[PDB]
Amino acid sequence: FLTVERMVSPIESAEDLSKQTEIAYGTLDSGSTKEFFRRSKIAVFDKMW
Amino acid sequence: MKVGGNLDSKGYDIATPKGSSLGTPVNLAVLKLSEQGVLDKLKNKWWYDK
């Protein structure tokens, strides 16, 4: 129990958050935030969309 | 999930009429995306991005 609690690393940046799927996430239904994700080709960001 | 390697080997190819005008160029076309990897993109992306 204690080792697993100590190993829990809180999400800080995008890539570490991107790999995990326990915590859901999403953007607005409109706006340039969605359009940025589509046009982005970064491996962190292409899988983001 | 999938376990182990491929027991046999085959391939997927496009269909062209006998001696068609698209016989040699498309065959050259399909083969030339395998170097810079733009064909390699389209396979691993659709399989393992969305």
Cα gap B11→B2, rounded to integer Å: 19
Size of interface A-B (CB pairs under 8 A): 3
Find out whether A9 and A15 touch, Cβ atoms under 8 Å: no
Q: How was this structure determined?
A: cryo-EM
Region label for A7, one of left (φ > 0), alpha (ψ between -120 and 50) or beta (otherwise): alpha
Q: Is residue A9 a known part of a binding site?
A: no
- B40 min Cα distance to partner chain A (Å): 15
Cα gap A41→B45, rounded to integer Å: 12
Chain A residue with minimum CA distance to B47:
A47
Chain B residue with minimum CA distance to A47:
B49
Report the interhelical angle of B23-36 vs B38-48 (nearest 10°).
Answer: 70
Q: What share of chain B is helix, strand, coil (3-state, %, to 5)?
A: 50, 0, 50
Q: In sequence order, which residues have a C-beta less than 8 Å from that of residue A34 and are 6 or more positions away?
A: A27, A28
Find out whether A11 and A45 touch, Cβ atoms under 8 Å: no
Chain A residue with minimum CA distance to B49:
A47
B47 touches chain A (CB under 8 A): no
Q: Is residue A27 a known part of a binding site?
A: no
